[PDB]
Amino acid sequence: GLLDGKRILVSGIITDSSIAFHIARVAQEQGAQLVLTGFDRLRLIQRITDRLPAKAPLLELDVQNEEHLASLAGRVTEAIGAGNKLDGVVHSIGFMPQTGMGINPFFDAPYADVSKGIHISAYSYASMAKALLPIMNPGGSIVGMDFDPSRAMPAYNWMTVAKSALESVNRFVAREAGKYGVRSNLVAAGPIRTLAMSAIVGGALGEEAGAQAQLLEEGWDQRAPIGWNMKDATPVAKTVCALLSDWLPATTGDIIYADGGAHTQLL
Amino acid sequence: GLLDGKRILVSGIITDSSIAFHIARVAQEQGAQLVLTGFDRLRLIQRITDRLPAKAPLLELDVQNEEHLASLAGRVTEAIGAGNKLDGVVHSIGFMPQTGMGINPFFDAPYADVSKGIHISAYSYASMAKALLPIMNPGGSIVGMDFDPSRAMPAYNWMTVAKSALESVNRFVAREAGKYGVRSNLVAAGPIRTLAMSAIVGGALGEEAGAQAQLLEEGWDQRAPIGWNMKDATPVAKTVCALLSDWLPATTGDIIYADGGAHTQLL
Amino acid sequence: GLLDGKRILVSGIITDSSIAFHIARVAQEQGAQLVLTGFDRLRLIQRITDRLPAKAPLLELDVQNEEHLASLAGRVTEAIGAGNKLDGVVHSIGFMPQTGMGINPFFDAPYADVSKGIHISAYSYASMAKALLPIMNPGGSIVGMDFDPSRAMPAYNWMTVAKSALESVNRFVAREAGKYGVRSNLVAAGPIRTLAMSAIVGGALGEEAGAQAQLLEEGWDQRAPIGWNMKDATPVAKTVCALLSDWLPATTGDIIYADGGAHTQLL
Amino acid sequence: GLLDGKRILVSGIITDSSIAFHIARVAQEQGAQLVLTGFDRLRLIQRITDRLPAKAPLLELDVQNEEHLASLAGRVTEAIGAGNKLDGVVHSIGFMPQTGMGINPFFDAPYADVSKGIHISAYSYASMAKALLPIMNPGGSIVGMDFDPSRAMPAYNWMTVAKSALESVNRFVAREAGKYGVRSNLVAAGPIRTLAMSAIVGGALGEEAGAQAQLLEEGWDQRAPIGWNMKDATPVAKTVCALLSDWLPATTGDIIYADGGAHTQLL
């Protein structure tokens, strides 16, 4: 059991296909005690989480609500029992208005919208560290989720630009985080079939949405030396737990690529 | 002459210390017929432009102003005579509330503020692109000003994150600018003491900021294999003018490091 | 146990301060049955390995010897018993003649000598993948030691170049090793005083070179957001064990930074 | 004219479709006094060099020839008149045995051949810099030819490794030419149909060469935001002149991308 002891916060669950779900599962399979946080559809996230191995707490956290952020360390400490601190925080959060995604012209998305995506997808990583680092033991990890925005691509539009700032924010978080002996990292996963995969990126594609298999399976399974599997999230979960473990103890402000090696290949 | 005949629009002039002032001057010397935009202190900017070698038109461009961007389309054409287009555009524009800068803590920066910075620092590259690309001739360049943000650093804080996104946006303009025959690039300059810079370097933004800003400005020259001068703005103006020219016709979505080679060395 | 049941070959031990030795000890601690290789002073190496927490077989491997490579495939299976195969291979091997290193100019190293360093430090990575992939299991892992050569530096000179090579070779091996079910990566470690290093650090390879040394070695702890101490190889000896394990299953051709996060920071 | 009165040494011409040939032509149009260096078939190079828009001195230079480099500064001074110096060096030199190219398996290229490949196409950039830096005026430029080696790719095999070091070397020539006030940069060009393309890459690629070649132009013009045409060598010739002129006066140890901007895009 790799994450034994280790109390870990885990945000961004919505379905049993949602990335955070498998991070949560694999964590529990390795002896982690969890605290999970939801957003908007709580009765529904609630139903989902019972499928996880252990009975685990569920806090509400709209990452745009300044009140939810203040009362966060509060609500958490009362869930793992005061005295005990957090060893891990997982940030699997993202949103971006459909107006700056897929076939909708890049120039046409308004800043009002792109701000919302950037607030949730990237800034919220720093605002969560503010909230949680206090209630964290030294040697514990923060892990956030990233998709390689280092090159531009069709569809991913303004979410590329957001994830691009996520990366930057993550290198500045690892400094504040290090003051407490805590690491801050992102995992750059390949594509995984989840809700956002199909609803956000999927719907904003419209007619040229048959692209999603050409582009993708082209840029990933074809490129990856060990193959990629859009239907298999356990790889990226296994990788997220490695950063939560003590086994990458000198890695911080970094990005790990769980993408089948596809960013290191051109063809 | 170099930019002979070409019609370049240049934004971001505020003083004669400003990067935009030099890009403008060096341009004019090479035969560029200009158009300028300023922001806020228009009468004060009017004074400074008359110091440039030749007289050039001046337009008001609040980059946050929805009206301005829209009419900007026309106001320019009315300024160079309809039946004439721009063969280049320079975006030397930037901002961040003294809270995502300096001694001011990284976490303390409110998103309300971090956004106002990003709106002006990064997004407005796409703003101007959509605004102006219709009145742009094939063969033209768009050149934005950038500061190497791939690594974190003290004080610069949320401006790094904004510059980090501005780079990602640059690659998504490159794609749309490509329709019209235009290249999109950033010149990553090293530091020049200006209105914005020298403010935080004297302790106005804290004594511990001006401290960390020495180590930067000094250690930069050390690394630069051909040296670095905070006071000479001419080489970056010269480099920006090279992209405006006919001489880099295979560069787009890309970044040119005009930093005296500093980013390539470790010590 | 982490490598519980895995049978890993570890090259490159020469003292009890070699990055190798620690990788091997930590690997043994986690339940990994081992096989080792040594070079040159084989008699003294014998002494060293015995101080390991477990008995391990020792093979001779002059990575330049085109014969040693040829038999190596077989000599190993002989050492773990036919019908058994390796679940991991480690490559902590490197060498550069004191002419492309130190007070010695960059220009003065002859190609004869530069090549020797490149044969042992870079090419010899594919050398061993060739020799060993046949006898490797699926799920297996290849890991070799890297030192961040993306930016140039004083003194390291040609070993810098040979790492830039080694980095590229790693991405190719990944393609070939992917055929057998095997990931191939590099742990990019910070500086460790491991004899090899600590030689130049005291004035052996010049006093001005040893000067430029501690400016790096200390410039590191300052940059590293969680700090970095050069006398402790246990953080990196673990990050190697992370890749050998089954917890990094989506990563190949990649480079992991166990450097205390100093490659992410500028200051 | 752009390079008026400047004296420039261009190596590695061998056809009228060689890249160094177009670099020569375009420089002369800008008004440069050239000095060329060929290799082996010096008499045939001579027939080709009269095709140039001017007459210019042609020397013999086997970069693998200890005598040639040794005499090199000599027979150059002699051919531009003494008291005069160089302002420009173009390094357009490359080679790798067919054994480490195309479909010829990667592990099977012997280090014997992989070494010759490096030395010539990589090391030689440093050994020429030594040869000429003495005889260069401050303000000059050394320029190399590079293919983007950051990600791996089919066929380009061990030549990816050479170019992968040709960069690491170029960052060390940068700081030794720093001493003399001279810049050292590489131009990463896109694919351009030349002799080497057809003989070494399309030669060691079997019957399926030319098929991958037609499919590369397509899948590059695609990725390029401003398109790309393999038959036109002009744009990369124009980019290398931009690096010789005064106009990128603060760019050294760096790489300029002349690929139509394809590396910044993923699809």
Ligand SMILES: NC(=O)c1ccc[n+]([C@@H]2O[C@H](COP(=O)([O-])OP(=O)(O)OC[C@H]3O[C@@H](n4cnc5c(N)ncnc54)[C@H](O)[C@@H]3O)[C@@H](O)[C@H]2O)c1
């Ligand atoms: N599956 C992919 O292809 C993929 C690959 C790499 C990285 N990512 C990133 O990793 C994460 C995983 O996303 P996913 O694939 O699981 O889709 P998902 O929608 O199932 O998970 C994303 C989560 O965002 C949460 N969320 C949305 N708005 C919020 C707000 N205002 N405040 C707090 N939470 C909010 C949702 O409740 C949801 O559970 C995201 O950050 C995403 O951008 C996804």
Ligand SMILES: NC(=O)c1ccc[n+]([C@@H]2O[C@H](COP(=O)([O-])OP(=O)(O)OC[C@H]3O[C@@H](n4cnc5c(N)ncnc54)[C@H](O)[C@@H]3O)[C@@H](O)[C@H]2O)c1
């Ligand atoms: N000073 C340096 O050392 C340096 C180095 C590298 C990159 N840069 C970048 O170059 C650009 C400008 O640098 P600078 O030294 O000239 O700063 P500056 O303060 O001297 O002038 C920059 C411009 O910001 C403009 N601006 C602010 N808000 C605006 C808005 N809402 N709408 C339109 N314009 C607005 C101002 O009007 C001003 O003219 C920026 O993008 C900056 O990040 C500066």
Ligand SMILES: NC(=O)c1ccc[n+]([C@@H]2O[C@H](COP(=O)([O-])OP(=O)(O)OC[C@H]3O[C@@H](n4cnc5c(N)ncnc54)[C@H](O)[C@@H]3O)[C@@H](O)[C@H]2O)c1
């Ligand atoms: N010392 C550090 O701080 C440091 C940091 C990052 C990466 N590295 C890398 O890690 C590896 C080893 O570093 P180290 O700290 O263990 O120093 P070390 O000298 O103790 O280990 C280097 C190895 O070179 C081996 N060697 C030389 N020629 C050989 C050949 N022909 N065949 C087989 N082995 C040969 C030696 O036997 C020795 O074990 C290298 O690849 C090196 O560049 C070292």
Ligand SMILES: NC(=O)c1ccc[n+]([C@@H]2O[C@H](COP(=O)([O-])OP(=O)(O)OC[C@H]3O[C@@H](n4cnc5c(N)ncnc54)[C@H](O)[C@@H]3O)[C@@H](O)[C@H]2O)c1
């Ligand atoms: N062909 C492309 O599209 C392309 C793209 C990016 C970079 N490049 C680079 O540009 C340069 C030239 O390639 P090219 O397209 O002009 O092919 P080319 O063969 O027409 O020119 C290459 C030159 O290398 C010379 N050469 C080979 N061995 C030599 C040696 N031992 N000493 C001195 N000269 C030697 C050749 O004789 C020839 O003149 C190389 O560095 C190459 O890798 C080419």
Ligand SMILES: Cc1ccccc1Oc1ccc(Cn2cc(-c3ccccc3)nn2)cc1O
């Ligand atoms: C949570 C969230 C909010 C907002 C946006 C996305 C999102 O979640 C993600 C969903 C999928 C991916 C990866 N991805 C994209 C597409 C694709 C389609 C077309 C072109 C190229 C990529 N396919 N696989 C990354 C994500 O971050």
Ligand SMILES: Cc1ccccc1Oc1ccc(Cn2cc(-c3ccccc3)nn2)cc1O
């Ligand atoms: C217009 C504008 C508004 C708001 C902020 C910046 C800005 O413009 C810039 C001005 C100078 C630079 C370069 N730079 C960095 C530093 C430094 C500072 C603090 C700490 C360590 C380094 N000094 N000089 C970059 C800019 O983007």
Ligand SMILES: Cc1ccccc1Oc1ccc(Cn2cc(-c3ccccc3)nn2)cc1O
């Ligand atoms: C195995 C081997 C053979 C030959 C040479 C090196 C070598 O191995 C390494 C030893 C130490 C390092 C890390 N490192 C570099 C320096 C340093 C010195 C001068 C300037 C700036 C850095 N100090 N610590 C990396 C290595 O690859």
Ligand SMILES: Cc1ccccc1Oc1ccc(Cn2cc(-c3ccccc3)nn2)cc1O
């Ligand atoms: C001078 C020299 C000696 C030896 C080898 C190359 C060389 O020079 C070059 C020749 C052509 C290119 C461009 N390129 C690559 C390939 C390709 C085909 C298939 C897959 C992936 C790449 N096709 N076109 C680049 C070069 O640097």
